[PDB]
Amino acid sequence: NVRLQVEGLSGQLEKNVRAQLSTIEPDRRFRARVDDAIREGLKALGYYQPTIEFDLRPPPKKGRQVLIAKVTPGVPVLIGGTDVVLRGGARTDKDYLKLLDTRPAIGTVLNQGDYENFKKSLTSIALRKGYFDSEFTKAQLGIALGLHKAFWDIDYNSGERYRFGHVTFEGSQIRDEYLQNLVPFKEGDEYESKDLAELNRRLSATGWFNSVVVAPQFDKARETKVLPLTGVVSPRTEGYSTDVGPRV
């Protein structure tokens, strides 16, 4: 029942380590696993060559057995260059241009998560806006430890923005003309993921169905850039005398 203690660390570094530590659950094998863990925490934050000296304290009177680890981060890797190219609709797209500005400046300390996040952001704007052919020609976080420098190389192609095709409904007790009135976009409008959510919600506001499943048809779209939707719905169906005769 062992306690890890880290001395020598401060700030964000301290936290990224401590976190990386509670990760594990007292011999040389276990100590090495601790050394590894501390090293992962520092790399992510730009420290590839630290020093870790362990002091293992004897199983105490009673209570909890301390393993200290005294850490000197050392010299950090700095961003020495970014080469990010955006091709396809992303080249001029307001949100891809916005993201391009969050690249780190030459000279700042390497943070791997900035790089991980950045790539995840491009994929996320692509999915929200229908750039379904989105691909990276290159995507490399390179570390030249000779130079203490890190380089981003990203060559990213959004491709063209797909367009909404026709919505076909099936199972419905409501006639098509009326479903078609509810679709929040015109055929040939540029895709936007939030219009799928708004289609779902408009459908629900009518009370007509108790189930809808809206499936984009990708198999076609791949080569026309027009995405038909299929909406499979299941309908929801749940004082005076009848014995009044007619006017005689």
| List of long-range contacts for 46-49, beta carbons under 8 Å, 24+ apart | 46/76, 46/77, 46/78, 46/109, 46/110, 46/111, 46/112, 46/150, 47/13, 47/73, 47/74, 47/75, 47/76, 47/77, 48/77, 48/143, 48/145, 49/74, 49/75, 49/145
Cα distance between residue 5 and residue 55, in whole Å:
10
At residue 216, φ and ψ (nearest 5 deg) are -60, 135
Sign of the CA dihedral with 192 first, then 126, 124, and 80 last: negative
Q: Which domains does the chain have, with CATH numbers?
A: 1-74 (no CATH), 75-161 (3.10.20.310), 162-240 (3.10.20.310)
Q: Which two tokens stand for residue 131?
A: 């750039």
Site of tokens 């659950």: 25
Tell the residue number behind the tokens 């989105």, with chain if given: 134
Residue (of 140, 113, 102) closest to 20 by Cα position: 113
Task: State the resolution, in angstroms.
Answer: 2.3
| Sign of the torsion formed by the C-alpha atoms of 192, 196, 197 and 199 | positive
Rounded Cα–Cα distance for residues 139 and 152 (Å): 8
Checking phi first, is residue 207 left (phi over 0); if not, alpha (psi -120 to 50) or beta?
Answer: left
Q: List the beta bridge partners of residue 166.
A: none
Helix/strand/coil (H, E, C) string of the chain?
CEEEEEECCCCHHHHHHHHHHHCCCCCHHHHHHHHHHHHHHHHCCCCCCCEEEEEECCCCCCCCEEEEEEEECCCCCEEEEEEEEEEHHHHHCHHHHHHHCCCCCCCCECCHHHHHHHHHHHHHHHHHHCCCCCEEEEEEEEEECCCCEEEEEEEEECCCCCEEEEEEEECCCCCHHHHHHHCCCCCCCECCHHHHHHHHHHHHHCCCEEEEEEEECHHHHHHHCEEEEEEEEEECCCCCCCCCCCCC
The two three-digit tokens of residue 202, written as one number: 């408009």
Q: Which two tokens stand for residue 171?
A: 């199972």
Residues 86 and 158: beta-carbon distance below 8 Å: yes
Residue 134 in contact with residue 158, Cβ under 8 Å?
yes
Per-residue H/E/C for 196-215: HHHHHHHHHHCCCEEEEEEE
Please answer whether residues 183 and 199 qualify as being in contact, where contact means their C-beta atoms are separated by less than 8 angstroms. yes
Q: Per this entry, what is the length of the chain?
A: 248
CA–CA distance, 134 with 88 (Å, rounded to integer): 9
Distance from the Cα of residue 95 to its chain's centroid: 15
Can you tell me the distance from the alpha carbon of 147 to that of 44, in angstroms, rounded to the nearest whole number? 18
Of the CA atoms within 13 Å of residue 15, those in its CB half-sphere come to 2
User: Are residues 74 and 49 in contact, defined by beta-carbon separation less than 8 angstroms?
Assistant: yes
